[PDB]
């Protein structure tokens, strides 16, 4: 089931979209550490922000505020629906904050009995007990003792099923606008708008988990902007820090006001070092030029994947948005995603899976055209070894 | 627009009430705000900056690894993670280490591991977790439910079940609630947040014996009391009681977000390399931190420095009659306020800040200090004189 590297593949150095291991073997990185290094490895602007803030102040706790956090909060507020933010360390933590907030808001504004959370089969929201129970893979939430209750799962993209389970006792709908791990499946426009309308009807909060699809990944700053559907709460991580552990939960003042002093917290969350790095990342990703390039680069990848399919006949579908790319394997290659991944690594290209039937790509948003061509040539060679 | 204290209220969720001032720079145990006012730091960002601010060795590790490789996913290991794992394994009971970002995440991992180990090695019905009143284990739904402060776990909908709370240091109560359906006892060897209360020796040894009797795992949350804080590398070493699982964070990265779950191979095998995970950058910094903290000289110094603080707190009490008890271990110090000042810890914290010294509380009745483990003697004396002035100002009123 899980993908792990053997003892002879230990990454030691990265620069841009290239990675070297202990043996000095060079790889083209189309995986980004699972869509994390959205500006590649050791990006000079990010290294500069790390080093300069690293000389000044790393940590003070939430007994205090700090300038890099306030600067970053201001940027996120100015660029999105958000009016308030909370910074944490990981996507899992941001989701914990979001889910607790949706629960607490319902409890204090409506009723302590308004507790149901609707989530989706194959969703991934993290590995904490609560977040993995909201996630939609029972294999990952089984076996840890009593799960937090009042979570209902229905199929992704099934609006009827959502309408059927939702009621006045529902506090939230939690959804990834594109399910990254779950086969790179994008919400349909009708489905996502439908969720907004149902949450409005039932006075439930719409929570978008944009940990994977946010911060430029789709070619808009956040996937919600592509759809034009505004959530009540949004979570962000991964690309937000370009490899530095940082995350954010975004909401409105009206919702945030349900939290009081002590309702939530974090030792490291809102760390000046993290926020200086995320500020630098944000300044680069949130530019017309970088967002446009994500679309150009997507089509460069897609054209290679189509060429590979023309030669080898291995894909049934190429999907995703921006530089989150899914390539679904044909029935003749069902369950082979891991083998194409390992073959890719032998050929010097790092890719991902999205379940056993789907190849996933999540390269740097600024991956050079020459790296796209070189890495896709390597991938084509790996494909040739698997099938030919 | 300039960034002010008012900016906080316009930007962050209202879960904190931060100080009037905004620290912009730190070096060692001194910190400066936007106005260039200089403070002595006896708080350490809540026991996190264990080597002070911008320690040259930690800055060097950050910059060196920062120009090399920051990030791998958990598919991979990396040299800094391997090195740090080896250091932790060599120095402790651990045979396996899993790295995460925060103390909350390390505790999630520990509690899920104790649960899953029971499930697969004993019975899916062996689920009870025993924890303690006033415990603090983090803010995720699971960890805050294992935590012993209902105020923090109420109001988020259905809590993960099968968690039983009894009083800290009450061994009989533990004996009474434990049974063959118990998977774990979770305990902070010293409850930091909970008034700086240390386990008694008989209590902690008692937990080990009861866990053995009932085939449950003993989980030590050393997020706050670990990584040198007590003057041993981990508090368990002071006590001579070996847990099955231990969690570490805060001091581990000296200010960089990093955490660790330590256990044996037998237990770790229930999860389906001696190390798992670990951000390269985080682990490089934590490795540099470990290299300094795990030295005879630094660990001895922690005890010297504790007595320098304690002598000051004693002098303050002699002059102002404010403390009923001075407690904790190493450079985790609690000073309990006398009944006349019950509930007024925040007043002394604010007066401290006005006087230019950063301190903590541990509930409304207890002052808490958690300075850099290498805080200079000159800073201890200066900061404690500032604190004496703050106490003087409060008591004069
Ligand atoms: C949609 C989604 N949410 C949450 C998470 C958890 O984030 P983290 O791994 O930063 O804890 C992930 C990680 O893959 C993700 O893909
Ligand atoms: C004993 C203990 N455990 C766990 C935590 C949670 O750590 P974090 O805030 O890094 O998630 C804390 C934080 O204060 C703590 O004191
Ligand atoms: Na806004
Ligand atoms: Na060992």
Curated annotation (Swiss-Prot), chain A:
It catalyses: N(2)-acetyl-L-ornithine + 2-oxoglutarate = N-acetyl-L-glutamate 5-semialdehyde + L-glutamate; N-succinyl-(2S,6S)-2,6-diaminopimelate + 2-oxoglutarate = (S)-2-succinylamino-6-oxoheptanedioate + L-glutamate. The keyword Amino-acid biosynthesis applies. Inhibited by gabaculine (Gcn). N(2)-acetyl-L-ornithine binds at residues 127, 266. It is found in: Cytoplasm. GO terms for biological process: L-arginine biosynthetic process; lysine biosynthetic process via diaminopimelate. Its cofactor is pyridoxal 5'-phosphate. Binds 1 pyridoxal phosphate per subunit. One of its GO terms (cellular component) is cytoplasm. The reaction catalyzed by ACOAT is highly reversible. This enzyme may also transaminate ornithine. Optimum pH is 9.5. At pH 8.0, the activity is reduced by 50%. CDD domains: OAT_like. Belongs to the class-III pyridoxal-phosphate-dependent aminotransferase family. ArgD subfamily. InterPro entries: Ac/SucOrn_transaminase_bac, AcOrn/SuccOrn_fam, Aminotrans_3, Aminotrans_3_PPA_site, Class-III_PLP-dep_AT, PyrdxlP-dep_Trfase, PyrdxlP-dep_Trfase_major, PyrdxlP-dep_Trfase_small. Pyridoxal 5'-phosphate binds at residues 91-92, 124, 209-212, 267. It comes from Salmonella typhimurium (strain LT2 / SGSC1412 / ATCC 700720). The modification N6-(pyridoxal phosphate)lysine is found at residue 238. GO terms for molecular function: identical protein binding; N2-acetyl-L-ornithine:2-oxoglutarate 5-aminotransferase activity; pyridoxal phosphate binding; succinyldiaminopimelate transaminase activity. This is Acetylornithine/succinyldiaminopimelate aminotransferase. Keywords: Amino-acid biosynthesis, Aminotransferase, Arginine biosynthesis, Cytoplasm, Lysine biosynthesis, Pyridoxal phosphate, Transferase. Pathway: Amino-acid biosynthesis; L-arginine biosynthesis; N(2)-acetyl-L-ornithine from L-glutamate: step 4/4; Amino-acid biosynthesis; L-lysine biosynthesis via DAP pathway; LL-2,6-diaminopimelate from (S)-tetrahydrodipicolinate (succinylase route): step 2/3. The keyword Transferase applies.
């Amino acid at each position: 089931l899980p993908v792990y590297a053997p003892a002879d593949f230990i990454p030691v150095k990265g620069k841009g979209s290239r990675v070297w291991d202990q043996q000095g073997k060079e790889y083209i990185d189309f995986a980004g550490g699972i869509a994390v290094t959205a500006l590649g490895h050791c990006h000079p602007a990010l290294v500069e922000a790390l080093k300069s803030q690293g000389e000044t102040l790393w940590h003070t706790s939430n007994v205090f505020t700090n300038e890099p956090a306030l600067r970053l909060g201001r940027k996120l507020i100015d660029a999105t629906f958000a009016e308030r933010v909370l910074f944490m360390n990981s996507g899992t933590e941001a989701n914990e904050t979001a889910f607790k907030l949706a629960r607490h808001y319902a409890c204090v504004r409506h009723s302590p009995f308004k507790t149901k959370i609707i989530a989706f089969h194959n969703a991934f929201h993290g590995r904490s007990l609560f977040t993995v129970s909201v996630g939609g893979q029972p294999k990952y939430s089984d076996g840890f003792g009593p799960k937090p209750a009042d979570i209902i799962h229905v199929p992704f993209n099934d609006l009827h099923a959502v309408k059927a389970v939702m009621d006045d006792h529902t506090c939230a709908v939690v959804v990834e606008p594109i399910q990254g791990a779950g086969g790179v499946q994008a919400a349909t426009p009708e489905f996502l708008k439908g969720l907004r309308d149902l949450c409005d009807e039932h006075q439930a909060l719409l929570v978008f988990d944009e940990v994977q699809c946010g911060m430029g990944r789709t070619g808009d700053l956040f996937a919600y902007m592509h759809y034009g559907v505004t959530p009540d709460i949004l979570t962000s991580a991964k690309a937000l820090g370009g490899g530095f552990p940082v995350s954010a939960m975004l909401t409105t003042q009206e919702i945030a006001s349900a939290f009081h002093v002590g309702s939530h917290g974090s030792t490291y969350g809102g760390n000046p070092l993290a926020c200086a790095v995320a500020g630098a990342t944000f300044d680069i990703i949130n530019t017309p030029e970088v967002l446009q390039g994500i679309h150009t680069k997507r089509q460069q990848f897609v054209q290679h994947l189509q060429a590979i399919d023309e030669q080898f006949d291995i894909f049934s579908d190429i999907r995703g948005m921006g530089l989150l790319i899914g390539a679904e394997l044909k029935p003749k290659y069902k369950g082979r995603a891991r083998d194409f991944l390992y073959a890719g690594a032998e050929a010097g290209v790092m890719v991902l899976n999205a379940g056993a039937d789907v190849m996933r790509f999540a390269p740097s948003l600024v991956v050079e055209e020459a790296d796209i061509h070189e890495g896709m040539q390597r991938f084509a060679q790996a494909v040739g070894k698997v099938v030919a």
